[PDB]
Design an enzyme around this catalytic site. Structure first.
Site, mmCIF file in Angstrom:
data_model
loop_
_atom_site.group_PDB
_atom_site.id
_atom_site.type_symbol
_atom_site.label_atom_id
_atom_site.label_comp_id
_atom_site.label_asym_id
_atom_site.label_seq_id
_atom_site.Cartn_x
_atom_site.Cartn_y
_atom_site.Cartn_z
ATOM 1 N N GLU A 35 0.822 -1.206 0.000
ATOM 2 C CA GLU A 35 0.000 0.000 0.000
ATOM 3 C C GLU A 35 0.854 1.254 0.000
ATOM 4 O O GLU A 35 0.555 2.215 -0.720
ATOM 5 C CB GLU A 35 -0.931 0.006 1.214
ATOM 6 N N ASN A 46 -7.697 9.400 -5.419
ATOM 7 C CA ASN A 46 -8.548 8.475 -6.164
ATOM 8 C C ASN A 46 -9.379 9.218 -7.201
ATOM 9 O O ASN A 46 -9.547 10.437 -7.142
ATOM 10 C CB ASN A 46 -9.486 7.731 -5.216
ATOM 11 N N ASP A 48 -12.539 9.265 -7.619
ATOM 12 C CA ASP A 48 -13.750 9.873 -7.090
ATOM 13 C C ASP A 48 -13.476 11.124 -6.265
ATOM 14 O O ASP A 48 -14.422 11.702 -5.716
ATOM 15 C CB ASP A 48 -14.545 8.852 -6.263
ATOM 16 N N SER A 50 -11.632 11.246 -3.510
ATOM 17 C CA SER A 50 -11.136 10.924 -2.190
ATOM 18 C C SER A 50 -9.633 10.715 -2.266
ATOM 19 O O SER A 50 -9.044 10.646 -3.341
ATOM 20 C CB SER A 50 -11.827 9.682 -1.637
ATOM 21 N N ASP A 52 -6.265 8.543 -0.248
ATOM 22 C CA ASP A 52 -5.816 7.511 0.677
ATOM 23 C C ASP A 52 -4.588 8.006 1.437
ATOM 24 O O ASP A 52 -3.694 8.612 0.845
ATOM 25 C CB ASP A 52 -5.447 6.211 -0.056
ATOM 26 N N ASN A 59 -8.887 5.549 3.386
ATOM 27 C CA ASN A 59 -9.555 6.401 2.411
ATOM 28 C C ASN A 59 -10.431 7.452 3.084
ATOM 29 O O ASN A 59 -11.155 7.160 4.042
ATOM 30 C CB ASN A 59 -10.401 5.529 1.475
HETATM 31 NA NA NA Z 1 -9.430 14.006 -0.883
#
Ligand code: NA
Ligand SMILES: [Cl-]
Ligand code: NA
EC number: 3.2.1.17
Length: 129
Positions: A35, A46, A48, A50, A52, A59
């Site tokens: 990760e 990401n 969308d 968001s 991480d 997230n």
């Molecule tokens: Na964000």
């Protein structure tokens, strides 16, 4: 902070991740490797909108608040920046909530694709634990 493999294993064990919800320590070290490459400061955006955060790439749509993910839940009740600390406590405590939510470690895409079904004990081999 960039952890060594055994250093991170020892920190995760002290924080109660060994066999937490049945996932042996090697699973957690493997997930952290793929990760974040063991880097607590890792961030990735990401599609969308968001983001991480941290060693376990938690997230912002569900788990922490970064002030820029509209409609996001903050289920760990923490600012996402707290997940980037050299102290992994906040990441570990949030990860425990995530892994208890029904889907286990399948919540971590890298664990599913790169650790699940492999000999994860190799990730703690040689470590003084
Ligand atoms: Na964000
Ligand atoms: Cl992957
Ligand atoms: Na970063």
């Amino acid at each position: 902070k960039v952890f060594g493999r055994c250093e991170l294993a020892a920190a995760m064990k002290r924080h109660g991740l060994d066999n937490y919800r049945g996932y042996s320590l090697g699973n957690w070290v493997c997930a952290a490797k793929f990760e974040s490459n063991f880097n607590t400061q890792a961030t990735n955006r990401n599609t969308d909108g968001s983001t991480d955060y941290g060693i376990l790439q938690i997230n912002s749509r569900w788990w922490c608040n970064d002030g820029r993910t509209p409609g996001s839940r903050n289920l760990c009740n923490i600012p996402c920046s707290a997940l980037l600390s050299s102290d992994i406590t906040a990441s570990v405590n949030c990860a425990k909530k995530i892994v208890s939510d029904g889907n286990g470690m399948n919540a971590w895409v890298a664990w599913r694709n790169r650790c699940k079904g492999t000999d994860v004990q190799a990730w703690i081999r040689g470590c003084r634990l």
